[PDB]
Write a structure and sequence with these properties.
monomer; alpha/beta; Methyltransferase, Methionine Synthase (B12-binding Domains), Chain A, domain 1; Rossmann fold; Cobalamin-dependent Methionine Synthase, domain 1; 12% strand; binds cobalamin; Methionine synthase
Amino acid sequence: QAEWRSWEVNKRLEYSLVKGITEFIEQDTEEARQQATRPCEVIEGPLMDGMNVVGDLFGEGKMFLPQVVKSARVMKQAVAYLEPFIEASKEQCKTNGKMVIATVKGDVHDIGKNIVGVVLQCNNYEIVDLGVMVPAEKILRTAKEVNADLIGLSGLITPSLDEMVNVAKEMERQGFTIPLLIGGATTSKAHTAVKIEQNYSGPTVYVQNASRTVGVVAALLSDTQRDDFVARTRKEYETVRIQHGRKKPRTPPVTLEAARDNDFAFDWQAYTPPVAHRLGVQEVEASIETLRNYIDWTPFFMTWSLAGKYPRILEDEVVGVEAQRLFKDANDMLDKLSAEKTLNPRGVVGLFPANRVGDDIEIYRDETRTHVINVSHHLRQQTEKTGFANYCLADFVAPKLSGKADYIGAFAVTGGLEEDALADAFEAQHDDYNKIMVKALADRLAEAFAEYLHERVRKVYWGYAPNENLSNEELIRENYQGIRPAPGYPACPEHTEKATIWELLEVEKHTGMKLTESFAMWPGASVSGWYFSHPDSKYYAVAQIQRDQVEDYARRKGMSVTEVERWLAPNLGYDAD
Ligand code: B12
């Protein structure tokens, strides 16, 4: 008594894949198995026909990524049922190719890699996901032992670019021949071609998103396009290299001393910085009930590869129905996590007396301002400026010689320490929809905590806007006085300053969050940065700084110039090697 239950098993398998239905997967697979001679006949035939249809529908724009992920779920359950029969048998299963994929050493975030992997498993590629913070040695060893046809590397932050070049170079040094696949939030085609590709004599390919990867992989594993595609990419990377190659209409640079002379022009003697209602460090927690109202749903839809802005995405004529069901799944997950207390957002916040000296911010033990407990270092824009200041974030804090009492805040927050454990539980159950869901929700929780806690700080701990009453949308549009710049962003690009935040707040002690050696944070779903209250403070890109700033910055930090050049590679107005 159900139309599709009445079709031949092979059409049932397809319908159940396409529709993401799991209830009859074992029995339909058990039936298909009997229908065939070798167990693997089931995967190679109806199961991949299913994924054949799924792929064409996605191609046509009749399914989107959340549904493709739900199909992958029915597929991995069929296979999980079959594995006993396949193993306890002769044959062992024809695939379209095998990839080893990893998040690079020092890097923690894996949502994007997760999605690239899932998508490739739906095209009958075997994927060996080595997880995160993966050492180059681990990656090359695994690809040998397993005989991978490709290696793919994901990275979120700037230091991961270095790790990727380091992986390329080790591949050359061991004489690897297979394609190296490059993607992730920090990666770009320009950086692949100029810095990575020349280090390896196998093909190096930047790939923008999961969807494009499928065609790249196929072009690379085909005996009639491989060569055509490789040539073409190389010819592309050569072009990219000669294009950027002569440093395209660059603004003129300035001496560090001329930059500092054109600092933010302000009248400190007429101003009275708002006085922090509270000073010191406090650990904090916020329930999922509190934090859900502060969620910015747009990057979440964006992560599930549904374009559009929330609430309107829900009405969109194309993705609206799927945006609604994605959102309903997300809210049901939040309701369980929140009722059962299995993901517990947490952070630490602090406010300190402080004052600018030069391009840094001095931070004091108490309001006598006579013992300096730490220093926040910053960079100054070093291009030539017409009218405007060559900004530096320190500029927004009362110079010490003004005699004005100023303050600085820091925070580190996480959507919850359980994130990895919850994710493994779903990985263990072959459930990629919920694995990517909880990780993407944990991230919505970290950011919601960062908005919420910033608001608590404007209104209460620092307390210079206790009557602010801003809707979620006005929060997203940043209609409030003050900023919460986060190390890594172009406005404070030096990632190692997170050490300062970790020092000032004792983050790891108070909340359990850790810094990797690239200064990524663990858990993946974490945000830390600073608080400034000045009303003219903004997120001005630091951009392109010179040797003279690198050297002076090297001195302030007790680092060698080369260590600094490495941490600031994307901001150097000169070629360091
Ligand atoms: C949402 C977001 C986050 C989230 C989650 C990040 C994420 N993975 O998306 C959280 C809130 C967790 C995060 C935190 C921070 N982030 Co943030 N984040 C953003 C934001 C707004 C969007 C990221 C996004 O597009 N995700 C979409 C997912 C689906 O895509 P993806 O990860 O890019 O991968 C896709 C493709 O890259 C490709 N792909 C991915 N990997 C691979 C691998 C292979 C082999 C292939 C073929 C393809 C491929 O397929 C994937 C899906 O199709 C951007 C700004 C921006 N507009 O991009 C920054 C941004 C990436 N993050 C940034 C930084 C600095 C931070 C923080 C360090 C800030 C801080 N807190 O001090 C922290 C670090 C967190 C940590 N270390 O644990 C900077 C990083 C760049 C840099 N180093 O300067 C960015 C670029 C913002 C900026 N303006 O600079 N942020």
